[PDB]
Coordinates of C-alpha atoms and ligand atoms in Angstrom, one line a residue:
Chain A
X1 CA -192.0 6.1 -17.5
X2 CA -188.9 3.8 -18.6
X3 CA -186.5 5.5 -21.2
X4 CA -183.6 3.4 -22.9
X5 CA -180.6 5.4 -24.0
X6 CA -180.5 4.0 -27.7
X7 CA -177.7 6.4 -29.5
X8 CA -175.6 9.5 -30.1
X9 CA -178.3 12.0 -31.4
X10 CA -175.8 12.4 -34.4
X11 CA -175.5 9.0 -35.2
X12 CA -178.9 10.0 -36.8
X13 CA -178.1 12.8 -39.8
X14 CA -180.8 15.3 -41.3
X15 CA -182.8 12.9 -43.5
X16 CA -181.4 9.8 -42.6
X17 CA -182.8 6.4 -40.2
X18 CA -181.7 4.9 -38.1
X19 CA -183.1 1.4 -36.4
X20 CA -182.8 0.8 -33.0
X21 CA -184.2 -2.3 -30.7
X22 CA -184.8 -3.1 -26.9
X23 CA -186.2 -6.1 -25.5
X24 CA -187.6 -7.5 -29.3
X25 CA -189.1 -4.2 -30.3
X26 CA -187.6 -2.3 -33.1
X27 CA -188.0 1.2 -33.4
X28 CA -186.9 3.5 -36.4
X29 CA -185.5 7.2 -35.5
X30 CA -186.0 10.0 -38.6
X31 CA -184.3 13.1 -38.6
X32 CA -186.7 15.7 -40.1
X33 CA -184.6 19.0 -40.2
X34 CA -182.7 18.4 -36.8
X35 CA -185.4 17.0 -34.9
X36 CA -185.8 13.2 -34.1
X37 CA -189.2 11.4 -34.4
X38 CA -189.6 7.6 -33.6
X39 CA -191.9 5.2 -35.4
X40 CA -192.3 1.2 -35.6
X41 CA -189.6 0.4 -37.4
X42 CA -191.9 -2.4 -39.6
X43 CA -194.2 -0.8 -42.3
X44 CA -198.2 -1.9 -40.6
X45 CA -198.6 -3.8 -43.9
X46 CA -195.3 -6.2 -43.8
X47 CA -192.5 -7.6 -41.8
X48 CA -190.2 -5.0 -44.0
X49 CA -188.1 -2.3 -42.1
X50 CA -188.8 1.4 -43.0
X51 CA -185.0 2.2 -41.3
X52 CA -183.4 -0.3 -43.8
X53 CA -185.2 0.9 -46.9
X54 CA -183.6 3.9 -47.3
X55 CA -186.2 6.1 -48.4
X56 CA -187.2 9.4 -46.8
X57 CA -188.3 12.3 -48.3
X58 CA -189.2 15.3 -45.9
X59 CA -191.2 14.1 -43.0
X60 CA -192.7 11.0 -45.3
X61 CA -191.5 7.6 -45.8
X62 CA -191.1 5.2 -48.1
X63 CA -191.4 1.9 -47.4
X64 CA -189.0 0.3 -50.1
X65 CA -191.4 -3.9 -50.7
X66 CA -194.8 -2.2 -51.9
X67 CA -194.3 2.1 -51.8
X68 CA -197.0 2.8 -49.2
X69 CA -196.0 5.9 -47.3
X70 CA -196.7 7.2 -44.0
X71 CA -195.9 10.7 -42.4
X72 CA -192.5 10.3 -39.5
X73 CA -194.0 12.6 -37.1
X74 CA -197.1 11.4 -36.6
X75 CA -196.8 7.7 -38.2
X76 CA -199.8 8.5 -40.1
X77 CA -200.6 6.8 -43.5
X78 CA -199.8 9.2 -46.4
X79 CA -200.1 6.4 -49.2
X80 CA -201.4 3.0 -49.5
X81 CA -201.0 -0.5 -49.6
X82 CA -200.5 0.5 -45.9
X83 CA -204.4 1.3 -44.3
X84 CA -202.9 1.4 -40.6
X85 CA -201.0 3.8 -39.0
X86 CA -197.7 3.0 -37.4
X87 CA -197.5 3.4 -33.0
X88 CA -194.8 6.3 -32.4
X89 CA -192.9 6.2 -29.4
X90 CA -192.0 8.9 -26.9
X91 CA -188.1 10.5 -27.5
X92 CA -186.2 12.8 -26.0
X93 CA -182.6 14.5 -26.9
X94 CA -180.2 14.6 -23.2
X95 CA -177.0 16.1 -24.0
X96 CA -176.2 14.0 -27.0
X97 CA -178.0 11.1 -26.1
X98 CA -181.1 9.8 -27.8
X99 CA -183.4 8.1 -25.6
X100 CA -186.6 6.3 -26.4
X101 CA -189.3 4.3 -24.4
X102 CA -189.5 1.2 -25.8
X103 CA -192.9 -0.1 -24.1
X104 CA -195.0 3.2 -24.5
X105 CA -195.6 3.1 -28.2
X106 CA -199.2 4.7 -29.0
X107 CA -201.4 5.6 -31.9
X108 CA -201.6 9.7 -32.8
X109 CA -204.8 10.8 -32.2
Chain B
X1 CA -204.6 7.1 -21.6
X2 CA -204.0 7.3 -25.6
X3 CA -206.9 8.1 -27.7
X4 CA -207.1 7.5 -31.5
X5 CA -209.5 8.7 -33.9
X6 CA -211.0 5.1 -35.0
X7 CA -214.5 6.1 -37.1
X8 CA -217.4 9.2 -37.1
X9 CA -219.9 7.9 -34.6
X10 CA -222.7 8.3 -37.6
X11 CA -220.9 5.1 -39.1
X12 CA -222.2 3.3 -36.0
X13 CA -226.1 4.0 -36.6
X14 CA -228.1 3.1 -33.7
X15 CA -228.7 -0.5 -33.1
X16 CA -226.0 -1.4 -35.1
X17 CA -221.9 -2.2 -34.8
X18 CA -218.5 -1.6 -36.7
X19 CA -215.2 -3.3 -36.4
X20 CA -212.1 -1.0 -35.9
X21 CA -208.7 -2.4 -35.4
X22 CA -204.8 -1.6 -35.0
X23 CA -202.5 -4.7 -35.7
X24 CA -203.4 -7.5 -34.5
X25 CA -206.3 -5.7 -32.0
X26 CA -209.7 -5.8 -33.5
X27 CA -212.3 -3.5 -31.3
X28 CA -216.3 -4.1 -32.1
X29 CA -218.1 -0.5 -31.4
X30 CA -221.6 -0.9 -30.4
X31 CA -224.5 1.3 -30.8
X32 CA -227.1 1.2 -27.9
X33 CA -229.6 3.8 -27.8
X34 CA -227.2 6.3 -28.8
X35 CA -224.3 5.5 -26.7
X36 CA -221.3 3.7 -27.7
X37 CA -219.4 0.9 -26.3
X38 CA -216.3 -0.5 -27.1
X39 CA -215.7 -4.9 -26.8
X40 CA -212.7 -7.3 -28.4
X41 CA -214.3 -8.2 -31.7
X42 CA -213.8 -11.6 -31.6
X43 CA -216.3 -14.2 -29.3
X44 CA -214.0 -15.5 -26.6
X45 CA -215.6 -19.0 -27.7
X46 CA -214.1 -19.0 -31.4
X47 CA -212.4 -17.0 -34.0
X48 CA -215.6 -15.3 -34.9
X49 CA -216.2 -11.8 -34.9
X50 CA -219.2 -10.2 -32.9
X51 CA -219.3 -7.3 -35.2
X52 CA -219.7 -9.2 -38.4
X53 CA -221.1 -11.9 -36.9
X54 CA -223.1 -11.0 -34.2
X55 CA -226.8 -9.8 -33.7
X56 CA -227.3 -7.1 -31.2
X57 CA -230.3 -6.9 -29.5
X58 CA -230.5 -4.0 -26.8
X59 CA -227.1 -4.3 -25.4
X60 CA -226.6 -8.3 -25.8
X61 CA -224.9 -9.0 -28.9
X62 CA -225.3 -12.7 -29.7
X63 CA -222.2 -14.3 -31.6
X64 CA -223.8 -16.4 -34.5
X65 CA -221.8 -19.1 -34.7
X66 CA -223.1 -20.7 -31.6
X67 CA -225.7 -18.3 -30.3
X68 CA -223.3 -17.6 -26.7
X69 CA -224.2 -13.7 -25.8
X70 CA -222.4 -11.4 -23.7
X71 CA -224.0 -8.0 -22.7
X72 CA -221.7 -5.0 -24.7
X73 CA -221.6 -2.4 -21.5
X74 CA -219.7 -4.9 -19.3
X75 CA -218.7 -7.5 -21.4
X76 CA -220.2 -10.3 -19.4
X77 CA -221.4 -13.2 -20.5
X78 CA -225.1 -13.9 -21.0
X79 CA -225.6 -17.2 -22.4
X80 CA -223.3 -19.7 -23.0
X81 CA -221.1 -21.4 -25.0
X82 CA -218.7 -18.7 -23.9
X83 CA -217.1 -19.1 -20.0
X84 CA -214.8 -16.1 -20.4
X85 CA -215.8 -12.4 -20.7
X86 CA -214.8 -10.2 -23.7
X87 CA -211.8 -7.3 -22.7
X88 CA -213.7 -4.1 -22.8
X89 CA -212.1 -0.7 -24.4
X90 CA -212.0 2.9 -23.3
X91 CA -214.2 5.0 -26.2
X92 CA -214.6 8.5 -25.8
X93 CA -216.6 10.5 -28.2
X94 CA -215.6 14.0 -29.3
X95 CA -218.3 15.9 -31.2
X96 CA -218.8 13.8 -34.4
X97 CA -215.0 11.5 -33.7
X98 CA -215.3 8.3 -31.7
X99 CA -211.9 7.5 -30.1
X100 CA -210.4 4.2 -28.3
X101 CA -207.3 3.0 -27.0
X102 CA -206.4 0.0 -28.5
X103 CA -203.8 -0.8 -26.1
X104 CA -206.2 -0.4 -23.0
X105 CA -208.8 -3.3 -23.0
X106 CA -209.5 -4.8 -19.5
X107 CA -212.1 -7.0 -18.1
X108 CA -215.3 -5.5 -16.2
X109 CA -214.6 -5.6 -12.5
Ligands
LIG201 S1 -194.9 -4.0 -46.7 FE1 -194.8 -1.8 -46.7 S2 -196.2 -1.2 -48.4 FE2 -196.3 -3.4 -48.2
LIG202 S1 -217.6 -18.9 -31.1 FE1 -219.0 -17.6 -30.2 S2 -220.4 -18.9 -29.0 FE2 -218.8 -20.2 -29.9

């Protein structure tokens, strides 16, 4: 329902993050082989940015204070500390813009 | 709506409840008879959670710390302390998965 342009779809390169924020929410964009998911950007078990960190391997990452993992596309734990699951957000590719709707963040199934 | 997979509805055994939560949104899932229904954990009264510290009888659950009750279909209270009625949540049940959406709690008409 309410989409906020947030960046240049290539301001986010094949296995890189990128962190982006609207309205106090941050929200970290993964490239996974030239497709764009959005996740919280804080890991559910600490105020600690998964963008920031650095670490993403595939479609998992890392976050860099305590190594719990969770899975980009579907912000589902893939390694603890972490026991939650991050909310993904809904994003869509216009031209070359990267939008994302900063108050619809849900759960995967 | 936005369903998550929370629990197996056998780990809510008849007469009995389970706490689920997402962040800072803790759900108490209630067994009556064989149906489910989804409250806030936590007693509007008090930081005290219904799930752990409650005592369901039929479809009253009866927070222990002061002995308030609230009935677990509608969320209405039944006896005081409590003044305010808990949020209720969506649950859906989908062969053997129960599902809620954390984000979705309401009060009873
Ligand atoms: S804060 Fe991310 S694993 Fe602990
Ligand atoms: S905290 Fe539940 S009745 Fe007071």
């Amino acid at each position: 329902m309410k989409f906020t342009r947030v960046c240049d779809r290539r301001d986010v390169p094949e296995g890189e993050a990128l962190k982006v924020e609207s309205g106090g929410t941050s929200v970290a964009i993964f490239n996974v082989d030239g497709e764009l998911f959005a996740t919280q950007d804080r890991c559910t078990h600490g105020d600690w940015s998964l963008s920031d960190g650095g670490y993403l391997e595939g479609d998992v990452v890392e976050c860099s204070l305590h190594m719990g993992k969770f899975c980009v596309r579907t912000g589902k734990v893939k390694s603890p500390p972490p026991c939650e699951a991050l909310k993904i957000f809904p994003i869509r590719i216009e031209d070359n813009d990267v939008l994302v709707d900063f108050e619809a963040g849900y759960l995967a199934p």
